[PDB]
Structure formats: C-alpha cells, structure tokens
Design a protein around this ligand. Sequence first.
Ligand SMILES: O=C(NCc1cccnc1)[C@H](Cc1ccc(F)cc1)NC(=O)[C@@H]1CCCCN1S(=O)(=O)Cc1ccc(F)cc1
Length: 157
Amino acid sequence: HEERMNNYRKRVGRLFMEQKAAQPDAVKLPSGLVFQRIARGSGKRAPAIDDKCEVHYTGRLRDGTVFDSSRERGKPTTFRPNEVIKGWTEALQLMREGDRWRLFIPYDLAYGVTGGGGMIPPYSPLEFDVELISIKDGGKGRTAEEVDEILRKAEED
Ligand SMILES: O=C(NCc1cccnc1)[C@H](Cc1ccc(F)cc1)NC(=O)[C@@H]1CCCCN1S(=O)(=O)Cc1ccc(F)cc1
C-alpha cells in the first residue's frame, strides 16, 4: 500500500523539516525553504531567473541516501533557476558567487506528490548542499542590498 507509506512519509517528513528549522543558524523563509549558510562568497549579484549557474552539489534523502551528486562527475553542472525545483529556484536567486548553503526543501517545493524519478518517493523532503561557482556573464538579479533585506525580514519572524 502506497497510501499507508504516504501517511508515514507525510509525518516523518514534517518532523524532519521541523528538526532543521530548530537548528541554531537555520533560516526559515515564508515559503518553507530552510537553509544554513556554510561559506560566504565574494559575489555582488545573484543570478536572475534565466541566468546560467555553475554549481557543485549533493542531494540526500532524509535517511542519508544520496541520490545525485556533481562531484562524482568531477566537474560542475550548469543549471538555470527556471529549470529546477522551487526550493532550488528560490535559493539560487539569493546566493552570490562563492556561497555555500545547505538546503532543506519540503516536498511541496521539491518533487511533490508524484516524486522524482526512481530514488525520490512521494511526499519526500530533500537535503542539498550547494556551491555557486560562477554565473554566466555575471549575475543580473538581486544585488547584495536586496538579499540582505530578505534575510532581515526572515529573522524578524
Ligand atoms: O527536475 C528538474 N527539473 C524539472 C522539475 C520537475 C519538478 C519540479 N520542478 C522542476 C531539475 C533538472 C533535472 C531534470 C532531469 C534530470 F535528470 C536531472 C536534472 N532537477 C532539479 O531541480 C534537482 C535540483 C538539483 C540538481 C538536479 N536535481 S536532482 O538532483 O533532484 C535530480 C535527480 C532526482 C532524482 C535522482 F535520483 C537523481 C537526480
């Protein structure tokens, strides 16, 4: 039965997202995306919705299983914010070159009710660590001023 598995997946996944939101340096955005800043980069602009980004990353289920990783391919993968899941679209448009964040994405901002491919079941929250290596022809989105105001409103809740 997938319905019994989904009821379980819904409860423990909620607990997982509740745990990381309680971690000390974790930031919680109104959408539900929770992240932790690992490294602070020297970039000045964030990528726009259609900018190409050079990214090193690793994705984990909340039980520890890694389902994908760009380091075993060795070189960085190219993505656009308008090509990825919602949690990745929101995070990328707030990160500058050199930043390293750990993302905790609830299922409704990831692959949702259907799931993602083979190794990501329905109602699954996702854990990513993400490094933004560079942005093609420079970021054309948020400046450092726009980003800090979004974090300032977040920590104000
Ligand atoms: O799915 C995507 N866009 C379409 C879409 C669907 C639904 C909602 N919104 C958008 C993109 C682009 C992509 C498409 C097809 C691929 F084969 C690979 C990438 N992906 C991602 O957003 C995340 C983000 C981090 C990099 C890539 N992954 S990922 O690691 O989870 C992929 C993965 C999933 C399960 C695995 F077992 C292994 C790998």
